[PDB]
Amino acid sequence: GTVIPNNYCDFCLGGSNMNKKSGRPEELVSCADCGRSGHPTCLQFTLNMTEAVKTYKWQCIECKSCILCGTSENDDQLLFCDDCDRGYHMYCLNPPVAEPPEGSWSCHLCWELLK
């Protein structure tokens, strides 16, 4: 479509040449659907998550849709993987899940790839 990645971070307003929160250059990651951008550290991503989100069509929090069913319904039930940031409805998982776990939860794609 008409998507162009924004050249500034939604959080600190810096470009890739200078994260204004850290005072260091830092690449931006940009939502595949709406083009909003953020520095990974401004998005509070780990370094491994930073690498992961650059390998697929990452979506920002607002655009995130479930990998399994494709909808953006039920924000309260859309888990974000703590290794790759993909979204999965707890009711789209099998076995479905009743409550967000405590501490990290990671998706089946990451379980297949990393373990």
Partner: peptide, 15 residues
Amino acid sequence: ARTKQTARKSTGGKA
């Protein structure tokens, strides 16, 4: 674990 809802609430600095 994070959901969209909890992630929204903990990332308030997002434009």
